[PDB]
Every structure is written in C-alpha cells, then in structure tokens.
C-alpha cells in the first residue's frame, strides 16, 4: 500500500523535488526515485497524469532531458511516465506540439536503458497516431516522417530483449489492435505483446489470454489494413500462447 | 505501465538520510520524505522490504519512534512502510521479538493520522498472527492478549473513516480471507475491504470484483467456523459491491 496520492498532493511533492534537483544540476538517486515514483503512480491513473501536466511537468521533463542527456535510468523513468500520460485520450492534445513531438520522435533512436526509452517513446507516439491525421495539427516533424522512424525503431529492437517494464493489464495495448487508423500503432502494440510473451511467457501469456488478446490477434491476420509483417508477428504471438 | 523493482542503492541512501536526521534530532521534510519514499518503493515490492531489514531498518524505526514520539505524520509513514514489510512471509521471522511485538501492540490504540497508525499496526500484527502460534514462540506480550487488543482496535474504528491509504491490489488482504488459522486476521481484512468499499466504492468495488474477492467473501459466510461478526461484515461488502454493479 501507499498514502493517498491525491489528498497528500504527492505528484506536486515529487515535481517540487525534481525542480530543486534540476536547479542544483544533480541527477542522484533521489532525482531518479522522484521520476520513478511519478511513473508508478500514473499507471492507469489519469488524475495523476493530469496533475503532472497541470503542474508544468512537461517543462521539467524537457529541462531534465537537456541537463542530463546521458542519464539512462532517468530517461527510462521520464518516458515511462509520459507513456502513462499518453494513454489518456483527453490529455493527448496537450502532447501535440512541435516541441514535444520532436522530442518523442528523436528519442525513437535512443539506446538508453537497452530499448526502454525508444520503446516508451514509440508507445507515446502510437497512442498519438491512433487519434488519426486530423489530430496532428503540427507542421514540423511531419506525421509520415515520424511514422517511418517508428517502423525503423520497432524493427531494430531485439525481440528477445529482457525488459525494465511491467503491465498490470494489457488493455491500453490491446486497444491499438482492432483498428486501421494507424497500422504503425498496431505494429508497435503487436511487438509489445510478442516480446513479453516471448521472454516472460509464464507471466504474460495468461494475462494476454484472459483479457481477450487471442481473437484480437486472429482478426489482425484477416485485416486488410494490417501490414504483412504485423500479420506474421501476430500469428507467432498466438503460437506461443497456444503452447501455453 | 510501471516498474516495481528492488533498488539497493536507494534503500541504502534513504536509510542513511534517516540516520543522519535522527542524529540531528530533526524530523523535517527530508525525514518525512525518506520514510514516505521507503513506503512508496516497498508497495508491492518485497525486494525493497528485504533490503530495508538487511540494512538495519528496524533499529532506525525504533529510534525514530523513541526520538519523535508525537510526530503523527512520521508515525504514519513508518507504519505504512512496516505494513508493506509485514506482507512478505519470508521476512516476518525478523519481526518476532518481544521488543517489536510490544511496540506494534502498543500502537493499536494510536490516534495518529486518524486511524492510519492503528490500522497499519493491526495489519502488521494480522499478517504475523496468520503465521500461527509456533512462529510467536516465547515473544511477549502473550499472543492472546495481542489478539484481544486487535479485536478492540478494529471495533473502535469508524467504518466510514476517511482514509490516507491507497491499494493498487488487494492481494495481501485477500490472502487473509481463506484461512482459519487467525480469526482476528480475517476480521481485520474484511474490515479493510468494508471500509474502502463503503467510502470509495468507485475505486474499490471494481478492484475487489476483478481480483476475485466475491467468492472469498461468499465462502466466509458459508463457513461454519467463521465468526458471525465477520460473516456480517463480509455480507455487507458483497451487498455494497452487488449494488455497485447496479448503478453501473
């Protein structure tokens, strides 16, 4: 258990501490904990994502990225937090700026913490791209260029990567499967499931099955808008889950 | 998504800051931050609980309690942390000393931060009681005296108490339902659910339902050996949850 984050204003407490550490130019264990705490308290918790944005958290994120460009765990934790923010459809419009899209697109090539920074940045963009081209009112980083960078990132990851992430539910990922608005978001989501059932089948195969992932992946194989590579990946995900 | 992983260097860093603030005799925001950070990182994370104990956490706890006997926020943070430690079965043997049991039992009557200190002390003791009488050994006070104080504490709390707690999973509470070793621990766990579904149904009815709490509570009501007062609380939880699905 933990305290009541809303009543205690814990999101604000963390962001104030991050601001103090950033001014002292220190990325120590306390700085990294503060971001790790924000990542963890925003999991499936939109009110905490909303409070992060309303307390100017995006500015602290960008300033920390620039002041600490080689701090890999810091980058992982910050991008995990933003991955949770990006799952909230009502908050995504706040991510649709050239400043923010450029950062996420640039992080697709990050080699920090193995694949975690690239993966979480691709997740952020996958939820953004799911809203369709009308939602992309940003002129610089063109949508098609970011999309091609997302395909490049996904294909570059080792499918047997061990991972510094966990999911209590696959529902935000599964929501990217039954749609043709954004094939790249569907491909990211299929890769996410494939990697997890490949490397951690005992935890993630039962999770994927219980939440209805199998019919969703079968539908991908029959889906006109899905790319050949996504259909091939989806059949293999079914493959490992049936063995289970 | 989330990441709940042990971090030896951070547990060590937090314990060192607490020890420093202890020597300074100052329970400032940093002292509260450090204990609340330990509470946060032990949530659903047994590895950080194990590291806390390996790096002398119990002595720091006792010393902070003795140095700062009226600081309610500190007590709430420390007992929150210990509540997470006590969920780990392999770590509970390290809590079985007369020194620690007396401290926890004497917190059952605490009025610090509403009910939070008394509630978390009772939770620590509920997981301890679940281990049975052999684990208690010759620890003092006697196991039956502590059990009676736990019953009394539970009945003293307002069932509609507002709370300074959050659960992301009820797993450690549900673990105390399908067992007959410790009736008081089953009662504490049923109370914990009853309070949360009474006061925060929109959050906790869906969690309890999704995590399989309904069959466990139904089983308590059908168990011939369960205490009627616990059966009636379990029934009220089922009633509240069944009502919840109606509204939605």
Cα–Cα distance measured from residue B184 to residue B133, given in angstroms and rounded to the nearest whole number:
13
Which member of A4, A29, A164 has the closest CB to residue B165? A4
> Is B1 in contact with A165 (Cβ distance < 8 A)?
yes
CB B213 within 8 A of CB B194: no
Q: Which long-range contacts (CB under 8 A, 24 or more apart) does A7-12 make?
A: A7/B164, A8/B164, A10/A37, A10/A41, A11/A38, A11/A41, A11/A48, A11/A51, A11/A52, A11/A55, A12/A51, A12/A55
Beta-bridge partners for B2? A166
Cα–Cα distance measured from residue B243 to residue B64, given in angstroms and rounded to the nearest whole number:
44
How near does any CA of chain A get to the CA of B39, in Å? 6
> Is A2 in contact with B83 (Cβ distance < 8 A)?
no
How near does any CA of chain B get to the CA of A210, in Å? 12
> Is A43 in contact with B2 (Cβ distance < 8 A)?
yes
> Is A80 in contact with B1 (Cβ distance < 8 A)?
yes
Residue B134 burial (CB count, 10 A): 6
CATH code for residues A10-243: 1.25.10.10
State residue A166 phi and psi, 5-degree precision.
Answer: -145, 155
Q: Which fold has domain B8-247?
A: 1.25.10
- Nearest chain A Cα to B173, which residue? A1
Cα–Cα distance measured from residue A112 to residue B184, given in angstroms and rounded to the nearest whole number:
49
Beta-bridge partners for B166? A2
- Cβ neighbours of residue B47 closer than 8 Å, sequence gap 6 or more: B5, B6
> Is A36 in contact with B3 (Cβ distance < 8 A)?
yes
- Cβ neighbours of residue A242 closer than 8 Å, sequence gap 6 or more: none
Resolution in units of Å: 1.5
**Residue A161: closest CA among A203, A116, A100:** A116
Residue B175: half-sphere exposure toward Cβ, Cα within 13 Å: 16
Cα–Cα distance measured from residue B218 to residue B232, given in angstroms and rounded to the nearest whole number:
11
Hey, what are A107's tokens? 């992080």
Residue with tokens 């659910």: B193
Residue B72: half-sphere exposure toward Cβ, Cα within 13 Å: 9
Q: Residue A80: which H helix or E strand, with range? A: helix A72-86
CA terminus-to-terminus distance, chain B = 26
Quick one: angle between helices B8-23 and B29-42, nearest 10?
150
What technique determined this structure?
X-ray
State residue A164 phi and psi, 5-degree precision.
Answer: -110, 65
Give the sign of the dihedral formed by CA B145, CA B151, CA B156, CA B157.
positive
């Amino acid at each position: 258990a933990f305290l009541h984050v809303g009543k205690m204003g814990f999101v604000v407490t963390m962001l104030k501490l991050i601001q103090k550490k950033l001014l002292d130019k220190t990325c120590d264990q306390v700085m990294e904990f503060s971001w790790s705490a924000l990542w963890n308290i925003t999991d499936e918790t939109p009110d905490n994502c909303e409070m992060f944005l309303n307390f100017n958290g995006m500015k602290l994120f960008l300033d920390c990225l620039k002041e600490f460009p080689e701090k890999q765990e810091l980058h992982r934790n910050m991008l995990g937090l933003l991955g949770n923010v990006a799952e909230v459809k009502e908050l995504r419009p706040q991510l649709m700026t050239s400043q923010f899209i450029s950062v996420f697109s640039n992080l697709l090539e990050s080699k920090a913490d193995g694949i975690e920074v690239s993966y979480n940045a691709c997740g952020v963009l996958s939820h953004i791209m799911f809203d369709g081209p009308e939602a992309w009112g940003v002129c610089e980083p063109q949508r098609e260029e970011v999309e091609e960078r997302m395909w490049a990132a996904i294909q570059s990851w080792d499918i047997n990567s061990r991972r510094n992430i966990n999911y209590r539910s696959f529902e935000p990922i599964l929501r990217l499967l039954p749609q043709g608005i954004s094939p790249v978001s569907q491909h990211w989501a299929t890769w996410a499931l494939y990697n997890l059932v490949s490397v951690y089948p005992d935890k993630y195969c039962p999770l994927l099955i219980k939440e209805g992932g199998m019919p969703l992946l079968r539908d991908i194989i029959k889906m006109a808008t899905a790319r050949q590579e996504t259909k091939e990946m989806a059949r293999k995900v079914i493959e490992h889950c049936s063995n289970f």
